[PDB]
Design a protein around this ligand. Structure first.
Ligand SMILES: *Cc1cc2c(cc1C)nc1c(=O)[nH]c(=O)nc-1n2C[C@H](O)[C@H](O)[C@H](O)COP(=O)(O)OP(=O)(O)OC[C@H]1O[C@@H](n2cnc3c(N)ncnc32)[C@H](O)[C@@H]1O
Ligand SMILES: *Cc1cc2c(cc1C)nc1c(=O)[nH]c(=O)nc-1n2C[C@H](O)[C@H](O)[C@H](O)COP(=O)(O)OP(=O)(O)OC[C@H]1O[C@@H](n2cnc3c(N)ncnc32)[C@H](O)[C@@H]1O
Ligand SMILES: [Mg+2]
Lengths: 447, 448
């Protein structure tokens, strides 16, 4: 074949397609028995359950183009109802929006802390974070260190910490300031990452995200997609690339590897990857998230005038969301254990995580939250073919020293994945970008 | 079929393989390279021994010290005598009988109070469970770099400290959680233990070099125990034991000890897949970045000039140098390293280019005689596919308190060794030895 793509996520599949329609031969070798990767949809209780990525919002041009091209309808994330905020061994507070549980002072400082991180972000080149003028200072500094500088009160530092852990699936301490700043630039600012209406959590897909990936996969000729076919090894010479699977061997001119960084370095590369790139991947840890859907017979919180959104900065769950489909049943409360609370939850059983979620909801939405019909969750850290969501972060010292290896081809081996995107890195939209860019590269470099 | 399969023929893998055989259980050691030693590696050049890998032992290192004397490898002192050369930025190189004496009264105070103030953090950091320090949460949330900045020392002081940090950790004070650095320091017995060249980790060398001593540990295994050029690709456990997949078939065991660097450990195909906290721990244990060099001269000409052969350069690509001349007294060798970002830059250049860079430093520090070079030999340990960086792993902020607890936890019938798992002299040969003895006991107790 002309091109072998490793991975049938949105990055893999988008690269495989652009290569196919250009007039070139391609195989996609995928480890799982399905497509979609970090997107994954299961039917439960008469509706779709997005165990992985579910949300699209404005500014995400490429996924909105894909959904529309392939005949997939969207519905809004519900917005109406009183939100509940809970601090410490305090009582729960009902407001028409989270924001209105904080003082005048507290809100000011919050929006000024966001406005401040955006200032840094705007100066970070999306294609080359290492080339910001303040790159030295910013890559030696954690986000936590920077927040502590702002001299913001504990309750505004707590609120900002819930938003950090909900966006990166890692604490402010794990991230370089330069990584955080690049990610905010990439998304078009803090409100773009955090908001529902006008934000990344604005819209969902009717029937869920995994079907959109399947529709993209059906644009490939029969025999192009190989499922349950993990790539163990990747060899290359001046003539082409030999892909060793278990029970088979594939031979192409060039390769696109579209897996999560930590899985990319697990492949037996021959010759061995250059050291800057091998060490970049040792410095690109995946985040830590357990995503859950609490299932009730009905969205009983709405009848109390409640949105179903709780925000508890001291609880092991950060933010919740009404995940009820457009038909109005079953009622769903969707949420996440993020960073350290996700690692602790992952070490426990399904039933122990259910009891923690239901306890928090009972003390916020109401005691009726213990009357659960079903609980459905996924630890993406446990998934051998992801090993953490939503994607990689870089700790201090990674971006300026190993980061330049991010996108550079090694010979005939090219790189895709949301982690290689300029815009909405970390999101489906970013995956799509990476696919388009990796394919353009291989068409150019081939003929 | 055997009782135990050890992955890695380094000092941790062999030390464990030894204590398993000595207990009367069958063992097979599987090693990806055509040799033993691992991060220790010695070659014959110019009629002497060239340690590309680990080389030094010193006081407190009671394991390696006793393994040496047992298998009969004699030691020789690292030379201490002659002026050291210190050099900051744009300034004039300073000769002093020791590095310290090139600093003001005021500077050396600030430096010593800096090391004291770190050692007092180190003292409350449990060697067995760093995550159980009273203030573990706060210390894990801080870099080494952030904490130094908070002590408020002068720059020369912070840069001299930085030189030392990178000579120990092979990574910047920004890459390291303070908690990780404090544990590393407690594990050694202090900053003097780590940085001194006498009463410290750089006091003594091994006659014939280090790979040999691991060859003498290998030779005390049964015939057929060791398969070199046998990399482990896959490890499958069920109720009755583990199945170790290589390229050339399978090897059934009751229990496995994996004794490879933590980054190499994670790349193995585990079945079932490893528990999340463990897999993600490995994701958070990156190896350091180090290129180690030896500059061959016909004679140690520098002893003529009343010079040690040690240069200390905070602002050059070359960190710390050491007189590497064998006791025979020829050839002259200047031993040194590129550390951290300097290792990664140098790593992407050729051997010839890295040679020019070191000679250019040496000539402006030791003198013009440094150009009359016989030969240059170096090794990029980041570039080795069965190491992927020396000296060992570091942990960034948040790693130790959240993922740390999985570090020694056995996973069904698979157990963990390597210097990264030692409580004492973690990151050294002596800590590999400890991890081997420890891993062995666990597996013997669990067999019977
Ligand atoms: C996990 C997650 C992600 C997510 C999120 C919530 C969770 C819990 N919410 C999101 C959302 O609402 N909106 C959004 O846009 N993104 C959200 N994220 C992240 C998003 O899902 C991802 O950024 C996107 O899916 C990334 O796609 P990409 O194509 O870059 O990566 P992938 O999905 O991991 O695909 C990799 C494929 O590679 C296969 N694999 C792995 N190793 C191998 C080998 N050795 N051989 C062959 N195939 C391999 C995987 O199985 C996978 O299919
Ligand atoms: C690299 C280095 C190390 C070193 C140092 C300078 C350099 C450049 N200076 C030191 C010094 O003066 N004194 C000292 O005590 N240590 C020094 N360091 C550190 C030292 O070398 C290490 O702490 C020590 O070597 C630790 O080794 P350990 O026994 O824990 O294991 P290893 O040496 O890394 O070897 C592991 C072996 O496993 C093999 N391997 C890897 N993957 C596989 C697979 N998949 N299958 C089979 N075998 C595998 C490796 O090839 C290696 O042999
Ligand atoms: Mg709302």
């Amino acid at each position: 074949v002309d091109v072998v793509v490793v991975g049938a996520g949105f990055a893999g599949l988008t690269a495989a397609r652009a290569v196919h329609e250009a007039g070139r031969s391609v195989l996609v070798l995928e480890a799982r028995d399905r497509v979609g990767g970090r997107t994954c949809t299961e039917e439960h209780h008469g509706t779709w359950i997005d165990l992985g990525g579910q949300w699209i919002g404005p500014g995400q041009d490429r996924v909105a183009a894909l959904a529309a091209e392939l005949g997939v309808e969207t519905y809004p994330q519900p917005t109406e109802g009183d939100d509940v905020v809970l601090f410490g061994d305090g009582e729960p507070q009902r407001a028409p929006d989270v924001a209105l549980a904080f003082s005048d002072e507290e809100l000011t400082a919050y929006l000024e802390l966001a406005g401040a991180l955006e200032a840094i972000a705007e100066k970070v080149p999306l294609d080359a974070p290492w080339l910001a003028p303040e790159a030295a200072a910013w890559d030696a500094t954690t986000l936590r260190e920077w927040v502590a500088g702002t001299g913001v009160p504990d309750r505004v530092a707590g609120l900002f910490e819930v938003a950090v852990q909900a966006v990166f699936a890692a604490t402010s301490a794990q991230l370089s300031l330069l990584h955080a700043a690049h990610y905010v630039h990439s998304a078009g600012g803090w409100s773009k990452l955090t908001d529902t209406e006008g934000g990344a959590q604005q819209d969902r897909l009717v029937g869920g995200v995994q079907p959109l990936a399947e529709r993209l996969a059906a644009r490939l000729p029969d025999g192009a997609l190989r499922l349950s076919t993990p790539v163990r090894g990747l060899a290359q010479d001046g003539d082409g690339v030999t892909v060793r699977t278990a029970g088979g061997e594939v031979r192409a001119r060039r390769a696109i590897v579209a897996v999560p960084p930590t899985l990319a370095g697990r492949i037996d590369h021959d010759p061995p990857l250059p050291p800057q790139r091998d060490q970049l991947l040792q410095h690109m840890p995946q985040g830590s998230v357990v995503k859950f859907h609490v299932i009730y017979d009905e969205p009983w919180w709405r009848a109390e005038g409640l949105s179903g959104t709780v925000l508890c900065p001291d609880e092991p769950i950060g933010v919740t969301f009404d995940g009820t489909p457009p038909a109005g049943t079953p009622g769903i409360v969707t949420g996440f254990f993020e960073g350290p609370a996700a690692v602790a939850a992952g070490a426990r059983t399904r039933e122990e995580r259910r009891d923690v979620v239901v306890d928090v909801l009972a003390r916020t939405l109401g005691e009726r939250a213990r009357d659960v019909r079903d609980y459905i969750d996924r630890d993406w850290s446990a998934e051998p073919w992801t090993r953490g969501c939503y994607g990689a972060h870089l700790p201090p010292g990674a971006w300026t020293v190993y980061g330049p290896a991010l996108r550079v081809p090694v010979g005939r081996v090219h790189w895709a994945g949301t982690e290689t995107a300029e815009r909405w890195t970390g999101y489906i939209d970013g995956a799509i970008e990476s696919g388009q860019r990796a394919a353009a590269e291989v068409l150019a470099a081939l003929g």
